[PDB]
Scaffold this motif. Structure first.
Motif, PDB file in Angstrom:
ATOM      1  N   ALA A 226      -8.211   0.326   8.547  1.00 33.70           N
ATOM      2  CA  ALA A 226      -8.158   1.476   7.980  1.00 33.70           C
ATOM      3  C   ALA A 226      -8.441   2.700   9.054  1.00 33.70           C
ATOM      4  N   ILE A 227      -9.913   2.388   9.491  1.00 30.94           N
ATOM      5  CA  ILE A 227     -10.335   3.568  10.457  1.00 30.94           C
ATOM      6  C   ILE A 227      -9.331   3.470  11.738  1.00 30.94           C
ATOM      7  N   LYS A 228      -8.663   2.525  11.947  1.00 29.52           N
ATOM      8  CA  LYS A 228      -7.729   2.590  13.186  1.00 29.52           C
ATOM      9  C   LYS A 228      -6.640   3.543  12.657  1.00 29.52           C
ATOM     10  N   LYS A 229      -6.240   3.677  11.483  1.00 35.51           N
ATOM     11  CA  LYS A 229      -5.383   4.482  10.885  1.00 35.51           C
ATOM     12  C   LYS A 229      -5.892   5.904  10.933  1.00 35.51           C
ATOM     13  N   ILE A 230      -7.169   5.973  10.569  1.00 30.43           N
ATOM     14  CA  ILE A 230      -7.830   7.304  10.386  1.00 30.43           C
ATOM     15  C   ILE A 230      -7.909   8.002  11.555  1.00 30.43           C
ATOM     16  N   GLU A 231      -8.250   7.520  12.748  1.00 33.18           N
ATOM     17  CA  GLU A 231      -8.304   8.067  13.995  1.00 33.18           C
ATOM     18  C   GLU A 231      -7.107   8.423  14.728  1.00 33.18           C
ATOM     19  N   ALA A 232      -6.246   7.593  14.347  1.00 37.50           N
ATOM     20  CA  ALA A 232      -4.741   7.451  14.723  1.00 37.50           C
ATOM     21  C   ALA A 232      -4.237   8.695  14.262  1.00 37.50           C
ATOM     22  N   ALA A 233      -4.630   8.949  12.615  1.00 34.85           N
ATOM     23  CA  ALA A 233      -3.799  10.326  12.167  1.00 34.85           C
ATOM     24  C   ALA A 233      -4.399  11.358  12.505  1.00 34.85           C
ATOM     25  N   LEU A 234      -5.803  11.493  12.743  1.00 31.42           N
ATOM     26  CA  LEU A 234      -6.522  12.412  12.939  1.00 31.42           C
ATOM     27  C   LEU A 234      -6.180  12.917  14.589  1.00 31.42           C
ATOM     28  N   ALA A 235      -5.624  12.150  15.328  1.00 29.40           N
ATOM     29  CA  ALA A 235      -5.203  12.471  16.613  1.00 29.40           C
ATOM     30  C   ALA A 235      -3.932  13.313  16.816  1.00 29.40           C
ATOM     31  N   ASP A 236      -3.247  13.082  15.634  1.00 26.16           N
ATOM     32  CA  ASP A 236      -1.993  14.023  15.572  1.00 26.16           C
ATOM     33  C   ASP A 236      -2.364  15.287  15.045  1.00 26.16           C
ATOM     34  N   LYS A 237      -3.037  15.108  13.981  1.00 24.95           N
ATOM     35  CA  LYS A 237      -3.379  16.217  13.129  1.00 24.95           C
ATOM     36  C   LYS A 237      -3.990  17.353  13.993  1.00 24.95           C
ATOM     37  N   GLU A 238      -5.130  16.878  14.769  1.00 21.16           N
ATOM     38  CA  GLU A 238      -5.960  17.883  15.873  1.00 21.16           C
ATOM     39  C   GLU A 238      -4.924  18.256  16.844  1.00 21.16           C
ATOM     40  N   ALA A 239      -3.707  17.615  17.035  1.00 21.63           N
ATOM     41  CA  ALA A 239      -2.767  18.147  17.953  1.00 21.63           C
ATOM     42  C   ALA A 239      -1.824  19.220  17.322  1.00 21.63           C
TER      43      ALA A 239
END
Lengths: 113, 136
Positions: free
Chosen positions: A95-108
């Motif tokens: 879950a956390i792996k997906k959260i950080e991965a998602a935020l990485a795209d959102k922040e971009a």
RNA sequence: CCCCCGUGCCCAUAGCACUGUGGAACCACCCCACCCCAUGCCGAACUGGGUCGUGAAACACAGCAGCGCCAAUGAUACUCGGACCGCAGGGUCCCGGAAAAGUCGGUCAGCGCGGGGG
RNA sequence: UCCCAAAAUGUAACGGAGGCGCCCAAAGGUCACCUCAAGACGGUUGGAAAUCGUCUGUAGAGCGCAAAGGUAGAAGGUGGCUUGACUGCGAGACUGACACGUCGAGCAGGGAGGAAACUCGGGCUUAGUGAACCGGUGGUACCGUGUGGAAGGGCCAUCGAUCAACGGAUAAAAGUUACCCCGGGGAUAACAGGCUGAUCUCCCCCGAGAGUCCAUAUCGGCGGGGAGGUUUGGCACCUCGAUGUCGGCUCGUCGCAUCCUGGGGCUGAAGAAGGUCCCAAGGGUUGGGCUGUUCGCCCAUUAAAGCGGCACGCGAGCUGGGUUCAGAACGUCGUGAGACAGUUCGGUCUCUAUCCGCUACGGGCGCAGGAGAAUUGAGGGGAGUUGCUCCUAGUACGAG
RNA sequence: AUUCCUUGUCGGGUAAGUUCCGACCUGCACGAAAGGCGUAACGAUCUGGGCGCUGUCUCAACGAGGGACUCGGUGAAAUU
RNA sequence: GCGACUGUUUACCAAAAUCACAGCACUCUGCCAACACGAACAGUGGACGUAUAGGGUGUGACGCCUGCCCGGUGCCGGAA
RNA sequence: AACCGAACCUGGAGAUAGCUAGUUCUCCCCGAAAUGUAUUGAGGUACAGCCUCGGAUGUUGACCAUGUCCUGUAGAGCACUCACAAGGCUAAAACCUUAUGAAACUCCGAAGGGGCACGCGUUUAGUCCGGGAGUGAGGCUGCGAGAGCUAACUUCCGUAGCCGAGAGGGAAACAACCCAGACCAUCAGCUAAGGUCCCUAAAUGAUCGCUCAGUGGUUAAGGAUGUGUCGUCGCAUAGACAGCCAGGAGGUUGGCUUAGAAGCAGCCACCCUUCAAAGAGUGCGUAAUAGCUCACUGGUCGAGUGACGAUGCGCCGAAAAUGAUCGGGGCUCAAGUGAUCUACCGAAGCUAUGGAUUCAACUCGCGAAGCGAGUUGUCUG
RNA sequence: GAAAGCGAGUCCGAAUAGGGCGGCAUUAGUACGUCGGGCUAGACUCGAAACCAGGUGAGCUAAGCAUGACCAGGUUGAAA
């Protein structure tokens, strides 16, 4: 019995992740980035991730007690305690792996403009 | 692809082929060369492969349905009772039977059709033709 | 020489099913049934007392290879044993044994005792 | 009960499925008698099933419960009488290592049902079970310690155990030890090794498809073939009269799947800065904060700041931060003592090298006189990193 | 230190803080006389920061004295 | 952070967040006390004390405090 | 009163010790077990199994044949059972055609195996009674199955051989494998396995080819017409698809759908003509066409070519950690390898000369125990 | 045979079926010895941790008690 808790754990978990993953899209007004107005917006994103972490931990500190205090009533022996742990970890870490991965795209995107 | 109702476990053994049929519901075919374990996760895998190549007119009579349920390795210690019979299903294929066969397509759309879907096969296979008669 | 009646061996290379030939002798139907005896209800069965008529029907003999049933030359599976191969799955060589099925074919019987008839 | 087998018997596995710890005042005994499942056509408070009827029907149904064998001349479905669901017995066999256990013709006593031949000593068979001791209760008048009884004892019968960890110590028995002790074990764990390699790591094959166009510049679904063994692990074979366990500090060193350099090919490569794959281990690969860490995040740099071996290299080198002695505390489990891959503060790890190997330095002898002294190089080691800048340049280059 | 779940999440000091001090609260498993919360002074208590100084360190270098080394004298051990 | 404080300890691995304490509390005991040592209706210690005295338990400067639950357990009381 | 979760000293017994270690003179004979059952049993022990000793017996043992009976691994197969491949067909079960799987399916069904009487080539055990035992987890390997990635020099049954308690030779080294079971002595001979260039013996022997990797010296999917050998499709006064120059013609004239998609992004369909001849299009490049080529034609060269299918050999795939190697040296003027033959070598196997030991019977001597003698076997190690 | 007890026979049982024994291939043997073995005792030899009895001492360290001993100097500054 693990085949029963596994579902109840993944369903409720993924149900939240899939929810927040859609709510974060409601924060993005459009483009994001109007002179210094980029980091201040990230503050709202921090709340989404903060609430996400807890949500992922709640199920772990809730479904565990449902089995821990259950296998003590002379129903399930040991060797299952750690087995249940490695079961929730593959869900929490994922879950956390997906959260950080998602935020990485959102922040971009919020910083893109 | 998947079964409906079966028992718990089964067995395993390499025996001779009881079906020396080359042509079945079509023209060309597909026969193996050496014994191998065909997992059910391969039939459907190669199915879509022979579908993207066939445009309007691609029928396949799959009769290699897996009927050899096996066990699966745990994830810690394999000491105790039996194992879980929930994973995949295979089927012993003795060199001499047919696993793939079509009808309607041309030669070029056949020699390459069975050629593509064969790399994921543990063993090597070949094609057949006419001159195949057994009974009425 | 024939045929019918029982009762056997045999236990579908004798069974079913298309059809026929048979009732004089035997065989069954049929007729009746207060009571012996008898049906969960009926005398269809069981059964007591008994014609003619009849023999589609139960039977009995007979023909026809539809289907059943049996079913070998050759040949392959397997293979005791003997000698090996590949990392393995697994595979072969030599001497014998060597069946499933399916191919040919073969049938719908054959062997008795007994009592009754021309 | 099947299944598992080296095919009569037998046979293991915390190997694959399923039942018992009964039931039946009578599905028992004897004698009579009844042709099942299921479909089909046609009828009923029926429109799924049954029921009535008629065809079909190697019986495909049934047999109280588990499976199998058995599967119709019936054990299968009904009725009368009946209660051998018997006492005294067993020729000879099955089976067991022992003790049990199973089957049984024929004998007798007396009975039951057919007319009779006859069948009848529980139930179609296989589970529905328990030694021995100790004691209850009926029958029998064998002992009964001076004789005569009696008490008590013996034998027939039978009852009692959920002895269920069921071939079964006592009439009757739970925990804890990090206060721990003794006898033993590597026929059993943790370290390490080993075998292995599912998991890990990585290489290769197929081409779904992205990539404007195009499958392979790059990326490669689905599925596959191997590799290495640094990961979880499995097995646990030397090692428990002792192979010291993490990490760091010290010293290193070796492999390539090469982080940096070095040469190459392809690019979707103009230059430039890249990508990618190929070749290539000479040499190099920083300083800190947090962390006990290996690992990871961050700071400031760099050609770069590689991955892994070497008993997760290195304690007869050091440290002792980590964990697996004692005290103490907290949360929590425990009624208690006590407890926890829970945290927490504390916590003595051993001057004197034999041999191998190794850094130096000598003593002998040999090198066919005895000396002084000048050399060849067989071979052997060391070293081998790299940036920036300027010159060609602001030139090839490119709209810039 | 009680909070397993990552370093939980903002905040503070730092160039950079898996620590520490303020807070939030989701306290896996706070808490009232197995006492709660707090408290000036004291603690060879534990924890984090700063000032100062420093061979703790970047790297050590040098000097000294006690062995170590050499000769005379006495001459042990574990081990095997 | 822990404890209030000085004080004590694990002679030969742990001096502390141990224990101890001053302070608070529940309870017990008026008799030849509870209580404890004792083979002993012997003796003695509690005390040549006598109840804000004596034993027991826990808690522990000082400060604001000390909630809900006696079913089960134990404790006193009752009682046809 | 220097190791106190219960001091120290003396006695209770040298407590118990099912656990450990050790157990002393020689030779000869036999020769085990690690299985089954029960076990507060699972390294323990009981009974049997297996050993030996001796007393009775004295061919019943043992393999090999023959006939006779019972199973129903292997295989198979459909009409039974559970699943199952394509269509029919019906209001889907069924029924049909084609096609299936199966430890727990089976109407079929072997090999071999098992009980029996019977005997020979055989053969020399078998058993009963009774004394004393030890062993009571066993290990590997092929085969036949479970477990388990049909992963473990993994585990658990069955079975055979070896080990275990058997050396000797072979596999470089090596309980397991291969050849063989060692009474003693022989500077004696024939073999088995395995080998015969040199490190050790024995043809760097023959013949026919395969090889050229230095393969032979841990692997595969998958690739390459690498070479050897087998077999199928079109042609030379059609003087060949492939090499060299030319043409490599048009028309016709809508799709879905784009700014475009009027040969080559995807979804259709793909006639005609002029001819010696030209496509119902196997690529590249562009936003679509241009442009480089495919099939077909002319000419001159043109006694040979092009497409696969099967096997014998081999190349790539192939990345490890103290320095490398087939045991090493080396080996293609092969000491590599498929087939052919012969010679030799080479165990403590067989053989020779000598001897000793165990069991039997046959000529002995003495009044006897007994001794020594010849003969066969043994001497199982 | 359980036993009464009967007996080249005796128990099961009011039956003639079997178990035990006799006859049959007929030992009845006994005592001393040596040797295998079994049982009971240290019982092949060596080794416990531990258990019990009696006794040894607080010239150990733990403490009580009686009686003595000791605490350079300096600082602070209570009540009264």
């Amino acid at each position: 019995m693990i085949s029963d808790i596994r579902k109840d754990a993944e369903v409720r978990m993924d149900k939240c992740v899939e929810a927040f993953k859609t709510q974060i899209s409601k924060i993005r007004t459009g483009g994001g980035g109007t002179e210094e107005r980029r980091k201040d917006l990230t503050k709202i994103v921090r709340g989404e991730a903060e609430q996400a972490r807890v949500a992922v931990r709640n199920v772990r500190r809730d479904a565990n007690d449902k089995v821990k205090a259950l296998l003590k009533d002379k129903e399930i022996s040991e060797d299952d305690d750690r087995r249940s742990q490695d079961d929730v970890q593959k869900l929490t870490d994922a879950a956390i792996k997906k959260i950080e991965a998602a935020l990485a795209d959102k922040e971009a995107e919020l910083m893109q403009f | 692809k998947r079964t409906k109702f079966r028992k718990q476990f089964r067995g395993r053994m390499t025996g001779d082929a009881k079906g020396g049929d080359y042509v079945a519901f079509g023209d060309y075919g597909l026969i193996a060369m050496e014994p191998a374990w065909i997992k059910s996760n391969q039939i459907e895998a190669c199915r879509i492969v022979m579908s993207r190549h066939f445009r309007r007119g691609g029928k396949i009579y799959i009769r290699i349905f897996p009927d050899k349920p096996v066990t699966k390795k745990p994830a810690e210690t394999r000491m105790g009772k039996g194992k879980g019979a929930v994973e995949y299903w295979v089927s012993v294929v003795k060199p001499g039977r047919v696993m793939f066969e079509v009808a309607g397509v041309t030669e070029e759309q056949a020699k390459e059709a069975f050629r593509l879907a064969g790399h994921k096969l543990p063993i090597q296979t070949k094609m057949v033709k006419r001159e195949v008669y057994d009974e009425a």
